[PDB]
């Protein structure tokens, strides 16, 4: 009985492979070989934040391109002012094991989560004068790996129990759950128009999800190991993924195959964080060799290297105005490059 | 402007508080507790005293923090980086599982020990072993032979010989005999001497690290 289901699944996979092989007439490199290269790119540190005294795991940019939020395993969450290198708030944490953080677009709330299987939402602009916990979301059986703010009342999360969820904040009840993964989900990215979001998991696959409807729409493969990071193109019709096999891949949402592979023989370590730049010409990635790299989104050729850390670079972000790039690592230091 | 000066003063106060809290927290000793399924972990927790469970206890002016991660059930590699700087690992193995099979439980326990001991993250971390269930061990040694678990074994059926064999077999999976070293102790029921052994191991490790850090050798 199960044998004919297995053979039907095999036949469906073969049919879809044969169909998708019929739209690969021209490789992208065949056409993006005549325009001029970007050239060598050099960046230097312009600020350095020296408050943390433990390993740093996550960071996020505010919506005004002037404020920051960072999380580290000393049990603290610090809100920075990048212009003057000041400290605005120092929020304590109940659990010292934190692996994610987020900043609301309205600038009123800050979220964190980790190995305690709870997402905590904090209220910043209060009338008493101190940061206070607002809601504790529970109901996940794995461990949180990412969290983003859809709006001021909705938040999405990804967990290590091969499921993703969307839930309200006023009522701590799950609204929709997305199922279909096999390995642990590691990172997710939200579309600029905020109707769809994509996630990448430990089973060497990336999936697209429809927020309003509730089921998957597409599935992408091509990696030989786990996927650690994933971003979204400013257009909204592409996304890039990082993996432990020391390579980065670009995807297109109207072809359904990978298009570019960025790799080199010198690099042998994995990729931890990925992020884009405005107008889609720069692709920044973090590695385990204590260095960050910048690539051209159209040609695999390297453009520069950021080398200022003494340990593994864990988080990376780019401001909305596209004027600064911030990096945090395991050496308890945050740096801003321009 | 005056407002910027007030902001600078506030930032300096925050920095001072952070430094004080970090200095205070840079003294406690952390240890991670792991086991293999059915084992007497809770007995030890009761003796000395969702995801991570934290237990706090003190004993002559030293503060100990215990982390239990048994109720995780995920890829251990992905979340094992977070425990790099731990002082020691407490491993508990059921000695009475050498007859019961489900592929013997003893083989699973030694596989877990091999996985943890030779991990790249734990290269200088000492491991404290706990042979927990031994109150009825001698009964089933004198009722059933040791050859079922280890047919290659040949020796007398006294409890001394079996205990020595199991200890030397567990300690034989250590690859680095100079960087790290392994403690072993047989756990008794209704016994309050576990904390003393933990203290002795912790102080030995502290002196070991302190001598290695700055001065000789």
């Amino acid at each position: 009985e199960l044998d004919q289901l297995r053979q039907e699944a095999e036949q469906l996979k073969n049919q879809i492979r044969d169909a998708r092989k019929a739209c690969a007439d021209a490789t992208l490199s065949q056409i993006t070989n005549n325009i001029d290269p970007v050239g060598r790119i050099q960046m230097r540190t312009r600020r350095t934040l020296r408050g943390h005294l433990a390993k740093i795991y996550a960071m996020h940019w505010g919506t005004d391109s002037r404020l920051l939020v960072s999380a580290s395993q000393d049990g603290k969450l610090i809100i920075w002012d990048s212009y003057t290198t000041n400290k605005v708030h120092a929020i304590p944490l109940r659990s010292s094991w934190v692996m994610t953080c987020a900043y609301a677009p309205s600038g009123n709330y800050v979220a964190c989560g980790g190995l305690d299987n709870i997402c905590s939402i904090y209220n910043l602009k209060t009338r008493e004068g101190n940061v206070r916990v607002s809601r504790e979301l529970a109901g996940h059986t794995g461990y949180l790996s990412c969290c983003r703010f859809l709006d001021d009342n909705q938040i999405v999360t990804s967990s290590g129990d091969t499921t993703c969820a969307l839930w309200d904040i006023e009522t701590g009840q799950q609204t929709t759950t997305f199922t279909g993964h096999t390995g642990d989900v590691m990172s997710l990215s939200l579309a600029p128009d905020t109707r769809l979001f994509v996630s990448g998991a430990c089973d060497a696959s990336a999936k697209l999800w429809d927020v309003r409807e509730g089921m998957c729409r597409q599935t992408f493969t091509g990696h030989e190991s786990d996927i650690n990071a994933i971003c979204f193109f400013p257009n909204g019709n592409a996304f890039a993924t990082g993996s432990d096999d020391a390579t980065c891949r670009l995807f297109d949402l109207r072809a359904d195959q990978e298009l570019m592979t960025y790799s080199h023989d010198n690099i042998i370590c994995g990729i931890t964080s990925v992020s884009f730049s405005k107008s889609g010409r720069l692709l920044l990635a973090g590695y385990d060799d204590f260095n960050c790299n910048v690539w051209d989104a159209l040609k695999a050729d390297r453009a520069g290297v950021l080398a200022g850390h003494d340990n593994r670079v864990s988080c990376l972000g780019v401001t909305d105005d596209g004027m600064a790039v911030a990096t945090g690592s395991w050496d308890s230091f945050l740096k801003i490059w321009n | 402007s005056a407002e910027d000066k007030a902001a600078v003063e506030r930032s300096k106060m925050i920095d001072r508080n952070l430094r004080e809290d970090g200095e205070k927290a840079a003294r406690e000793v952390k240890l991670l507790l792991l086991g293999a399924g059915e084992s007497g972990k809770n007995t030890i927790v009761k003796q000395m005293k969702t995801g991570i469970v934290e237990t706090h206890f003190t004993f002559k002016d030293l503060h100990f923090k215990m982390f239990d991660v048994g109720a995780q059930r995920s890829e251990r590699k992905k979340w094992i980086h977070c425990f790099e700087g731990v002082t020691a690992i407490i491993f508990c193995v059921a000695l009475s599982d050498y007859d019961l099979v489900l592929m013997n439980r003893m083989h699973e326990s030694m596989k877990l020990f091999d996985s943890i001991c030779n991990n790249k993250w734990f290269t200088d971390t000492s491991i404290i072993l706990f042979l927990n269930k031994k109150d009825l061990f001698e009964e089933k040694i004198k009722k059933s032979p040791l050859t079922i678990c280890y047919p290659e074994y040949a020796g007398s059926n006294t409890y001394e010989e079996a205990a020595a064999y199991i200890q030397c077999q567990f300690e034989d999976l250590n690859k680095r005999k100079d960087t790290k070293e392994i403690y072993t102790h047989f756990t008794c029921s209704t016994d309050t001497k576990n904390v003393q052994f933990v203290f002795d191991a912790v102080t030995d490790v502290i002196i070991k690290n302190n001598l290695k850090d700055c001065g000789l050798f």
Epitope: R66, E128, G129 | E9
Partner: single-chain antibody, 233 residues
Framework: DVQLVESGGGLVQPGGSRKLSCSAS????????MHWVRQAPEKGLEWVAY????????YYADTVKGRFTISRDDPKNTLFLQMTSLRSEDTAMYYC??????????????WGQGTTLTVSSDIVMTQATSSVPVTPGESVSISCRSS???????????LYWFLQRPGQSPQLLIY???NLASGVPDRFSGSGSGTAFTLTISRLEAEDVGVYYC?????????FGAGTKLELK
């Protein structure tokens, strides 16, 4: 929720001493800086003293520099002020004001109620107009002028607006020019520019009667304005 109540007053002869106490109730006192503001029986507002959070920097006025003492205690949430020598110009009404300072905060948010006392160079703010007739349904604007420009190189200006209803304590409307406060309707809008500032309200109501005030927060000797009335026939 937030409540500051002051006590200590009566009749003091010249050459005597007196002290005033301010009590607080639950607004994270240890992380707030406090001021003192004095109102003469006729009219006008003036600044007296200031103590920063953490008991660090302390500033006094150029008129009462040598005779006033300001102090605080984070436990018990109580503020103090000491009077050594009293002249005949010290008879006025005293208020307590809280203020905080970070990147996007709003200073001078909550005021007290008052405590009576009877004894028996610097920035100049003009606010030349004194009284203007008004009728509900039409916009009315008020203007004020300052000596020098209040536009620091940071890119932000420092001008504050206050309203004092009859028989009530002052309240904040605009903390920095073109920036609304909390608890106020959206019809208010400062929209000043350069060195001469203005304040426009779109529609009126029975609760908009009172005396308006202007303030500056650039040089720490703080100077208030004169005050304009809205008689509202």
């Amino acid at each position: 929720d937030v409540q500051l109540v002051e006590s200590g007053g009566g009749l003091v002869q010249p050459g005597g001493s007196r002290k005033l106490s301010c009590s607080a109730s639950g607004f994270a006192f240890s992380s707030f800086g406090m001021h003192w503001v004095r109102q003469a029986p006729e009219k006008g507002l003036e600044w007296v003293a200031y103590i920063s959070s953490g008991s660090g920097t302390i500033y006094y006025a150029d008129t009462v520099k040598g005779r006033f003492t300001i102090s605080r205690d984070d436990p018990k949430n109580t503020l103090f002020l000491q009077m050594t020598s009293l002249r005949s110009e010290d008879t006025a009404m005293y208020y307590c004001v809280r203020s905080i300072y970070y990147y996007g905060s709003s200073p001078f948010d909550f005021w007290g109620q008052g405590t009576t006392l009877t004894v028996s160079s610097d920035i100049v703010m003009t606010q030349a107009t004194s009284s203007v007739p008004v009728t509900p349904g039409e916009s009315v604007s008020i203007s004020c002028r300052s000596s020098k420009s209040l536009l620091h190189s940071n890119g932000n200006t420092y001008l504050y607006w206050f309203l004092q209803r009859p028989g009530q304590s002052p309240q904040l409307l605009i903390y920095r020019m073109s920036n609304l406060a909390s608890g106020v309707p959206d019809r208010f809008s400062g929209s000043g520019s350069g060195t001469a500032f203005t304040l426009t309200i779109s529609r009126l109501e029975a609760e908009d009667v009172g005396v308006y005030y202007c303030m500056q927060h650039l040089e720490y000797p703080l100077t208030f304005g004169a005050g304009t009335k809205l008689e509202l026939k």
